[PDB]
Scaffold this active site. Structure first.
Site, PDB file in Angstrom:
ATOM      1  N   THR A   1       0.604  -1.168   0.072  1.00 16.71           N
ATOM      2  CA  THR A   1      -0.084  -0.017  -0.048  1.00 16.71           C
ATOM      3  C   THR A   1       1.014   1.287  -0.112  1.00 16.71           C
ATOM      4  OG1 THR A   1      -1.637  -1.209   1.313  1.00 16.71           O
ATOM      5  CG2 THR A   1      -1.732   1.266   1.054  1.00 16.71           C
ATOM      6  N   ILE A   2       1.863   1.217   0.887  1.00 15.15           N
ATOM      7  CA  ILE A   2       2.976   2.420   0.649  1.00 15.15           C
ATOM      8  C   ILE A   2       3.486   2.744  -0.353  1.00 15.15           C
ATOM      9  CG2 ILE A   2       5.051   2.991   1.815  1.00 15.15           C
ATOM     10  CD1 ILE A   2       4.012   1.387   4.384  1.00 15.15           C
TER      11      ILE A   2
ATOM     12  N   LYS B   1      -6.297  -1.858  -1.242  1.00 15.95           N
ATOM     13  CA  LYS B   1      -7.172  -1.886  -0.071  1.00 15.95           C
ATOM     14  C   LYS B   1      -8.382  -1.298  -0.575  1.00 15.95           C
ATOM     15  CE  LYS B   1      -3.897  -2.263   3.866  1.00 15.95           C
ATOM     16  NZ  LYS B   1      -2.830  -3.273   3.202  1.00 15.95           N
TER      17      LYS B   1
ATOM     18  N   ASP C   1     -13.884   1.656  -1.845  1.00 16.83           N
ATOM     19  CA  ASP C   1     -15.233   2.015  -2.564  1.00 16.83           C
ATOM     20  C   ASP C   1     -14.724   2.334  -3.989  1.00 16.83           C
ATOM     21  OD1 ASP C   1     -18.049   2.764  -2.607  1.00 16.83           O
ATOM     22  OD2 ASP C   1     -17.355   4.968  -2.259  1.00 16.83           O
ATOM     23  N   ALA C   2     -15.807   2.576  -4.717  1.00 17.56           N
ATOM     24  CA  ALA C   2     -15.538   2.706  -6.256  1.00 17.56           C
ATOM     25  C   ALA C   2     -14.757   1.399  -6.823  1.00 17.56           C
ATOM     26  CB  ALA C   2     -14.501   3.891  -6.358  1.00 17.56           C
TER      27      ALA C   2
ATOM     28  N   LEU D   1     -11.304   1.629  -9.223  1.00 20.67           N
ATOM     29  CA  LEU D   1      -9.988   1.382  -8.624  1.00 20.67           C
ATOM     30  C   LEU D   1      -9.423  -0.100  -9.300  1.00 20.67           C
ATOM     31  CD1 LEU D   1     -10.039   2.838  -5.217  1.00 20.67           C
ATOM     32  CD2 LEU D   1      -8.356   3.294  -7.282  1.00 20.67           C
TER      33      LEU D   1
ATOM     34  N   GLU E   1      -8.968  -7.979   2.510  1.00 19.28           N
ATOM     35  CA  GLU E   1      -7.956  -7.548   3.270  1.00 19.28           C
ATOM     36  C   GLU E   1      -8.455  -7.632   5.017  1.00 19.28           C
ATOM     37  OE1 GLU E   1      -4.953  -6.080   4.955  1.00 19.28           O
ATOM     38  OE2 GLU E   1      -4.022  -7.297   3.596  1.00 19.28           O
TER      39      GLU E   1
ATOM     40  N   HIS F   1      -4.372 -10.470   8.767  1.00 19.26           N
ATOM     41  CA  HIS F   1      -3.289  -9.525   8.918  1.00 19.26           C
ATOM     42  C   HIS F   1      -3.210  -8.924  10.674  1.00 19.26           C
ATOM     43  CE1 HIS F   1      -1.411  -5.280   8.302  1.00 19.26           C
ATOM     44  NE2 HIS F   1      -0.625  -6.117   8.546  1.00 19.26           N
TER      45      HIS F   1
ATOM     46  N   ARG G   1       0.110  -3.903  11.745  1.00 21.36           N
ATOM     47  CA  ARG G   1       1.527  -3.420  12.092  1.00 21.36           C
ATOM     48  C   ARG G   1       1.316  -2.261  13.343  1.00 21.36           C
ATOM     49  NH1 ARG G   1       6.109  -1.031   8.129  1.00 21.36           N
ATOM     50  NH2 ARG G   1       7.602  -0.175   9.818  1.00 21.36           N
TER      51      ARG G   1
HETATM   52  O1  LG6 Z   1      -0.806  -2.102   6.258  1.00 20.18           O
HETATM   53  C1  LG6 Z   1       0.195  -2.216   5.316  1.00 20.18           C
HETATM   54  O2  LG6 Z   1       0.229  -1.764   3.995  1.00 20.18           O
HETATM   55  C2  LG6 Z   1       1.257  -3.071   5.627  1.00 20.18           C
HETATM   56  O3  LG6 Z   1       1.874  -2.566   6.689  1.00 20.18           O
HETATM   57  C3  LG6 Z   1       1.123  -4.392   5.579  1.00 20.18           C
HETATM   58  O4  LG6 Z   1       0.015  -4.729   4.861  1.00 20.18           O
HETATM   59  C4  LG6 Z   1       2.530  -5.308   5.188  1.00 20.18           C
HETATM   60  O5  LG6 Z   1       2.660  -5.176   3.810  1.00 20.18           O
HETATM   61  C5  LG6 Z   1       2.509  -6.518   5.855  1.00 20.18           C
HETATM   62  O6  LG6 Z   1       1.454  -7.364   5.170  1.00 20.18           O
HETATM   63  C6  LG6 Z   1       3.862  -7.296   5.531  1.00 20.18           C
HETATM   64  O7  LG6 Z   1       4.995  -6.665   6.043  1.00 20.18           O
HETATM   65  P1  LG6 Z   1       5.637  -6.873   7.335  1.00 20.18           P
HETATM   66  O8  LG6 Z   1       5.865  -8.248   7.160  1.00 20.18           O
HETATM   67  O9  LG6 Z   1       6.782  -6.137   7.333  1.00 20.18           O
HETATM   68  O10 LG6 Z   1       4.713  -6.652   8.443  1.00 20.18           O
HETATM   69  O1  LG6 Z   2     -14.694   6.049  -2.094  1.00 18.92           O
HETATM   70  C1  LG6 Z   2     -13.986   7.157  -2.347  1.00 18.92           C
HETATM   71  O2  LG6 Z   2     -12.833   7.097  -2.392  1.00 18.92           O
HETATM   72  C2  LG6 Z   2     -14.801   8.262  -3.414  1.00 18.92           C
HETATM   73  O3  LG6 Z   2     -15.975   7.367  -4.154  1.00 18.92           O
HETATM   74  C3  LG6 Z   2     -15.573   9.166  -2.712  1.00 18.92           C
HETATM   75  O4  LG6 Z   2     -14.915   9.290  -1.199  1.00 18.92           O
HETATM   76  C4  LG6 Z   2     -15.940  10.384  -3.056  1.00 18.92           C
HETATM   77  O5  LG6 Z   2     -14.790  11.120  -3.265  1.00 18.92           O
HETATM   78  C5  LG6 Z   2     -17.169  11.106  -2.607  1.00 18.92           C
HETATM   79  O6  LG6 Z   2     -16.512  11.513  -1.193  1.00 18.92           O
HETATM   80  C6  LG6 Z   2     -17.322  12.558  -3.277  1.00 18.92           C
HETATM   81  O7  LG6 Z   2     -17.729  12.244  -4.826  1.00 18.92           O
HETATM   82  P1  LG6 Z   2     -18.882  12.131  -5.249  1.00 18.92           P
HETATM   83  O8  LG6 Z   2     -19.816  13.446  -4.683  1.00 18.92           O
HETATM   84  O9  LG6 Z   2     -19.006  12.226  -6.729  1.00 18.92           O
HETATM   85  O10 LG6 Z   2     -19.915  10.982  -4.814  1.00 18.92           O
HETATM   86 MG    MG Z   3       0.507  -5.137   2.225  1.00 19.73          MG
END
Ligand code: LG6
Ligand code: LG6
Ligand code: MG
Ligand code: MG
Lengths: 213, 215
Positions: free
Chosen positions: B35-36, B63, B66-67, B71, B111, B135, B138
């Site tokens: 994710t990072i 992760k 929504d949408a 995504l 997740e 998970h 962390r």
């Molecule tokens: O929340 C996150 O995005 C990470 O901290 C996490 O998913 C991370 O990728 C772990 O799943 C594996 O990393 P570590 O073994 O260093 O905890």
């Molecule tokens: O889940 C998301 O990340 C977006 O769909 C959502 O947060 C979006 O940014 C809304 O907060 C505002 O967008 P709309 O007015 O088009 O729904």
């Molecule tokens: Mg991860």
């Protein structure tokens, strides 16, 4: 008065600029949508803040874990606020807030999806002062509309001491539903980005807001 | 079957991620764009890594909350093989991501980071989700939360539910024996492999241990 926030859910920066070059000066908050964070990376936050330094820049990162690591990246990129998804561990929300304090920024709990009132109490005790009550986009497309249950929860959150942001496919006609409640911020994404005249769309929200509040 | 080994690339820039991949790409089974790294570089991370290791499974730990259709499509168009959806996401978000996954012959993982319920777990199953990632947060780890019976029970129950389970969360070699006897699908290692004096030897030790406990 509730502030107006524009959600930039674009995939590339040039796409987002098509909207900001028109309404940047018409809103209070410029949000880097999750879609934009994932599309361009944190550079989106850094670039937008450099362009609109006088506006509040929100990074809708929806942090789920590694709270101090991810928040530091956003605040180092000059974000003012960052979002933390509601199901994150309480230690994650706490870490992001600790970092936010270092930058004089703030943290918001994204109430997207499932969450409980017990968690809500935990966030208060942790010191979190903002929550984003969100009607899921995927939920909306599945026929889910706004209702009394939402109004009730929103009022309850407000009574708890949170500054509440309402969002989720809000259209100008949905504003009346929240009259009487001290809403902190109203978010509009598609209703402004995709309107025939984004400027008129933004001003109408402002107008309606000033009139109802 | 032997649990597979997946390396999590929770780096902030691509170059930092490559210092690791150039060493262990062939020592592990699944390459994860943490994710990072996603937030750090954007979806280009997925595309660049897949072009570097096309024969390897590349997971985008997005992760999704929504949408889900938007995504997921972004990650799959960048050539991801698998994508992750956060557990609190509306069921429609998970379904939409799964629908896009099928179009790209990819797959979706729920997740399990943070709060979730068994009722939700049943819905993921009904929806047709076949993978979950147990998970240990962390931030909870740093808070002194260790792997306990509570986790083993949940993991076993998820497995009995028909889910292919991936375990992760600051895993060290010492923790592996705790999961012996359970048909774990994947073991993810991030820091224990990226930060070792010799990442290659760290990866191999995990493999040897896995073959010993599950062989
Ligand atoms: O929340 C996150 O995005 C990470 O901290 C996490 O998913 C991370 O990728 C772990 O799943 C594996 O990393 P570590 O073994 O260093 O905890
Ligand atoms: O889940 C998301 O990340 C977006 O769909 C959502 O947060 C979006 O940014 C809304 O907060 C505002 O967008 P709309 O007015 O088009 O729904
Ligand atoms: Mg991860
Ligand atoms: Mg958003």
């Amino acid at each position: 008065l509730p502030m107006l926030q524009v959600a930039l859910d674009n995939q590339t920066m040039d796409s987002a600029y098509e909207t900001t070059r028109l309404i940047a000066e018409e809103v209070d908050i410029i949000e880097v949508g999750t879609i934009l964070c994932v599309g361009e990376g944190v550079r989106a936050v850094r670039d937008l803040k450099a362009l609109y330094p006088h506006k509040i820049v929100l990074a809708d990162a929806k942090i789920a874990d590694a709270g101090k690591i991810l928040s530091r990246m956003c605040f180092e990129a000059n974000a003012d606020w960052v979002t933390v998804i509601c199901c994150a561990d309480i230690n994650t929300a706490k870490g992001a807030l600790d970092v936010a304090k270092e930058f004089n920024g703030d943290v918001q709990i994204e109430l997207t999806g499932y969450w409980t009132w017990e968690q809500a109490q935990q966030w208060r005790d942790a010191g979190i002062g903002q929550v984003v009550y969100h009607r899921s986009r995927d939920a909306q497309a599945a026929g889910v509309a706004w209702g009394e249950a939402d109004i009730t929860a929103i009022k309850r959150l407000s009574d708890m001491g949170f500054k509440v942001t309402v969002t989720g496919g809000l259209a100008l006609e949905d504003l009346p539903l929240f009259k009487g409640i001290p809403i902190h911020v109203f978010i509009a994404g598609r209703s402004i980005r995709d309107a025939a005249s984004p400027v008129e769309a933004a001003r109408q929200f402002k107008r309606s807001i000033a009139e109802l509040w």
